[PDB]
Amino acid sequence: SSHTVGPMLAANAFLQLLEQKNLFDKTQRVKVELYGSLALTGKGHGTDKAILNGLENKAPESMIPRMHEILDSNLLNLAGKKEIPFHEATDFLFLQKELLPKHSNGMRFSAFDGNANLLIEQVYYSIGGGFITTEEDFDK
Ligand SMILES: [Mg+2]
Numbered sequence: 725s726s727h728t729v730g731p732m733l734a735a736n737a738f739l740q741l742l743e744q745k746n747l748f749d750k751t752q753r754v755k756v757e758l759y760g761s762l763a764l765t766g767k768g769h770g771t772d773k774a775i776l777n778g779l780e781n782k783a784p785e786s787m788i789p790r791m792h793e794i795l796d797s798n799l800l801n802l803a804g805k806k807e808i809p810f811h812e813a814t815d816f817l818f819l820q821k822e823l824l825p826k827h828s829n830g831m832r833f834s835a836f837d838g839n840a841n842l843l844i845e846q847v848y849y850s851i852g853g854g855f856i857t858t859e860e861d862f863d864k
Pocket of ligand 1: 743798
């Protein structure tokens with residue numbers, strides 16, 4: 725909308741951040757948290773498929789079967805590239821009762837190594853329809 729386009733672009737951006745930071749090779753787990761209006765959409769209403777496909781390097785410019793295969797296999801093909809365990813129950817959260825502060829359409833991406841250590845987290849907002857911004861760039 726973007727409850728699909730912006731979320732997908734944020735996933736693409738997160739992937740590029742992992743490369744820019746040389747944290748991709750260390751990443752063994754990712755977690756996505758949805759807030760406000762994105763969270764209120766709920767499971768299987770676009771935003772989840774948009775993000776999971778975007779974390780596999782699909783760009784807005786098939787999505788629902790592929791979501792199904794990621795959930796069935798518990799493997800996310802990160803960036804192309806590298807298969808990691810993925811468990812929806814712990815790794816993809818719809819936080820319908822919370823808001824990030826700049827805006828309703830908030831999302832947080834996190835990458836962990838194999839020892840449970842947080843490597844990086846990044847907040848993006850989908851700001852409509854279809855642009856994204858980091859938390860840090862929001863006010864500019
Ligand atoms: Mg499964």
